[PDB]
Every structure is written in structure tokens, then in C-alpha cells.
Amino acid sequence: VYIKKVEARINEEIERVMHCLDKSTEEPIVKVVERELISKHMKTIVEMENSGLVHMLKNGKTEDLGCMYKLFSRVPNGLKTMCECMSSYLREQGKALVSEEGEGKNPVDYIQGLLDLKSRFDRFLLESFNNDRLFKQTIAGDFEYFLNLNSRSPEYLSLFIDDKLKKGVKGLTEQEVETILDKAMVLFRFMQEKDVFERYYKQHLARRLLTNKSVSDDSEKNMISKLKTECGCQFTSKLEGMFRDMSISNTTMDEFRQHLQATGVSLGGVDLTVRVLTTGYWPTQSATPKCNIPPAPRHAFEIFRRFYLAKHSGRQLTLQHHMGSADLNATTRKHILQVSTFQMTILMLFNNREKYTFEEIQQETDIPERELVRALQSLACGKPTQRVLTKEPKSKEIENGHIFTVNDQFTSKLHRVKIQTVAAKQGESDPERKETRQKVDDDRKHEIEAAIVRIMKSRKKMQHNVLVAEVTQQLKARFLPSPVVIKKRIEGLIEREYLARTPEDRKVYTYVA
């Protein structure tokens, strides 16, 4: 009511000075009328409580925001007094949202709430402040303030975009998909540390392309087009390489199908789907697992390796197990199961001889450690009433002398029943997070030491801290400058032939190319 009554006072003083007095005398007074009057209590007003700025921001009465915007536009420094309070409120909401305390922030929901509050802030800005520059720069600085924390945000947004790209069940049509993708890339625009973002996006690409195909088959072009406007074309060498590797993989798949229809004397070469890609693009999963393989996959891998070593003279093969899938035809009907290259060996050993235990699968198999544990648990532990591998010692923890059996479980209403225990709820355990952080750290290390040798060969020399400003400005849109890291790493170019960068004789640098 104070804004309304002071507006009525302003209007009545205007009409009074327009009739009883002369309009010329209004200006000095309106100064005091926005100063000794507004500015005076404006302080108490640009804070305090009693349905104040901080209360109408959380309530959402936009008319009051517009009214106070059109009122405080005359008084000097009033826009600053309201910008500081709205920035304080936004920082409070931010630190309440980025709260890392209580590890468990739902990924697709935290960034959703972030979008929800930044969108309502931006809409209140456009409707009240009329796209004002001061409010825009204040909220920009506010966003830059708390976005230095919460380093799992790029990973959360990458998990969000993967959930949205794997299947368009929500929003079957294309318009809302387009809008949500535009909003997603807009949210990504105000985000730093793009290296981990690209790393996790490439990991999600590998996860979605090395699994069941026909996810969207058209949205990949939209994604790569949006990434050319967002990340740029510096990360499309490995992006388009992923696509080209998928293409070469399916081409070699049909070619090997043809060559098997010609030869394929052994039963090992039946329904085969062998994809072919190169190490540089798709990172190594582990130390190329060499565990015992079933006789049919053994023959298939042997044929594929012989082909890759024969036709491709110079190229070879590397057998592994931590990738792919299969369709296990079981057999009252013939229900076909599914194994993701992990349970094939154990089930084959069961086919050769049942009534095995942990010792049997750890002695005559040459089985690794962590992944073996994972597969065994996924198969006999944490299973719903679709158990394909049961045991007598029912217990959560894994023992040694436990016999394995098989159950019918007719609940499968079809012939293609799959056990999708992998790709469960996003946990992001400490070991995998630490290893990917070390990987992105080595990537950052190589990136800064590859940009410096590309740039400083055609530029001037530094004395103490001249070229470091340039090398940080070139990487401003990539990640943090990390002054200590770059300072420790540039002193490692002395052992390098190109530009030793003599520390004591920093007066003149070399340019050996």
C-alpha cells in the first residue's frame, strides 16, 4: 500500500503544480520527493520485511515488482538498492539449492529446480524490469558467484540430456522436444568446466551407441548441430569419429555376415553382430579382460580377429568382455534370455557341468576381480521374481561354497526376456569418480601444454607473467585457469626441445620450430 499511496501523492502533487502553481517549480521538489522522501525511507524499504521485496519474490506478485520498478526509476541509486537485495535473496536460494550437505541430490531434479528458479527470475525480470541491463548484469554475476561450487553439475546435466535423448516417451512430438533442448543448451551456456561435460557426454554416447540401437535415429543430427553452436568444433573430431566408427562397425558387421554365409563352417559363426571401432575414439574399459569365453563366442572372436588381421594388413584385434550383449536361447516354451557379455562364461560353464560355486568359476576361468564380483552379484543378488540363477545359501553377502541353480520363472510373458541389472540408478561411486577426475586432470594438463606450443610459436615472449594471461584467456571458456598447475607445468618445457623457456635468462626466449 505504500507504493500505491506514494504514487497517488506523486500524481496529486503533479496535478497541483500543473494548476495552482507552475510546473517549472516541480523539478527541484521531485528531487527531494525522490530523495528526502523516497531515498529517505527507500533504505528501510529496499530491505526490512512486512510483505517486502524478499517476500514478493517468493510469493510472485509481479504487479508489485513492476510498480516499484516504475517508481524507483526516478530516485537515484534506487536500482542499486533493489539489485543488492534481490541478489542477496538469489544467493540465499542458490546456496540453499547447491547445498552439498546430505549427498543424494537427485540429478535430473536438482538442475530442473535450477532451471525453474532461473526461469522465474528471468520472467520476473522481463515483465517488471523490461530487460534492464543493470538487473541482467547483477543476476549474471550472482549466477557466476555460486556456480564455482557443485562440480557434479556438468555430470548431472549430461545424465539429464542422456535420459532425454535415450527415448522421447515424454513429449512424443518434436516441438516440446525442441523447446526442452533449447532450454537445456541455454542452461549449459551459463556453465563452466566444459571438459568434464564433454567427457561425460562422450561416455553417454558410448553407452547409448554400444547398446540396443534405434533410440531416436534423427535427434543425433540436432544434438551435433546444437553442440557446434555450444561447445564448438574442437570436440567434433572425436564426436564425428564416434559416428564414423559406428558406421564402419555396421558396415563391417554386414560384410562379416556375408563372409560367414560364404565360409562359416563352424557353428560358432551363427547370428553374429561384430562392431569395429578404434582405440583413440572409444577409451579402453579395463586391461582387455582375457577370461574363459564360451566355445561359440570363442569361434566368433577368432574369425573376427583373423579377418581384422588379414584384410586389414597392419591392423589386428584385442579380445575383451566389458562390452556388448547376447541373446541366450533357453528352453514349457523356449524363452530367449539376454546376457551382456558378462554371464556368458558362467552360464557356459554351467551348461558344461552344473552344481558349481565361486571356487569353480574363479579357478578354471581366469576371471578378473571387481567386474567378476559385479556380474555374480547382478545375477544371484538383488533379483526380482525373475531369477534365472538361484542358490541355496540365501544371503546378501557373497560366500565361497554356494551352489548355483536355475528356476523357471514363467512370469516372462514373452520369448525375449532380458536381465537389465546394469545401468541402474546413477550412483557415481568414489573409485569411478576419482579415476575420471584423474583422467580429466591429465586431459586438462595435456590441453594446456598443447595450446601453449600451438600459440607461443607465433607470438612474443614473456618476462614473468605476460603470456600466462593470454593462455588463460584462450582457456577462459574451457575451465578454470588453475594458476598453480599451469605455473608448475610451464617449468616442464625446459626438458622439452621446443622452447626450453630458460628461467634464469628469461630476458630472451627461443623459437626453435
Binding site: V276, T318, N329
Partner: protein
């Protein structure tokens, strides 16, 4: 039998003349330092000297290829201009 495999979908990775036993630029080994280094220590700090992986899928010590790039810039084991993707083994 009780369980018979019908479909398989392995993915087969491939390596060119990476020579996982002899860098083609300096001739020492895929790992085990390079010719400009040799000493595993010596002001190296966690031996700042790792393997570099090209798109052509060949492999050399980062140092060797990056020092070779100064002059020739087109990968000595084919003709491709040579790009980058993976660092380390």
C-alpha cells in the same frame, strides 16, 4: 543342451602399427621413456612423458611425435595429417 547361444554382438577394437613394443619414431618401447629422456627420474616429476594416440590409431611417446611435429607434420607410418584423441596408454 539347456542353454544355447543364438545371437552375439561383440565389438572388436583394432590397433594399427602402434607397435606395443617399439615406438616408431625413437625406437625404445611403447612405454619405458624416450630418447630425449631415458632416465625414469631426473627432474621429471611423475615422469612427464606419456604415450600419444593418433586418430590413425598409431602410437608414439608424446615427446617424440610432438618434437617430430616441429618439422614433418603428417604421421610417418601412413600419410594422414594425424590428429589427437587419447593420451597415455
Amino acid at each position: 543342451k539347456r542353454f544355447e547361444v543364438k545371437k552375439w554382438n561383440a565389438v572388436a577394437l583394432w590397433a594399427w602399427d602402434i607397435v606395443v613394443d617399439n615406438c616408431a619414431i625413437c625406437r625404445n618401447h611403447i612405454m619405458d621413456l624416450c630418447i630425449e629422456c631415458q632416465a625414469n627420474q631426473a627432474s621429471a616429476t611423475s615422469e612427464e612423458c606419456t604415450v600419444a594416440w593418433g586418430v590413425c590409431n598409431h602410437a608414439f611417446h608424446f615427446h617424440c611425435i610432438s618434437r617430430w611435429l616441429k618439422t614433418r607434420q603428417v604421421c610417418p607410418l601412413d600419410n594422414r595429417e594425424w590428429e589427437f584423441q587419447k593420451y597415455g596408454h
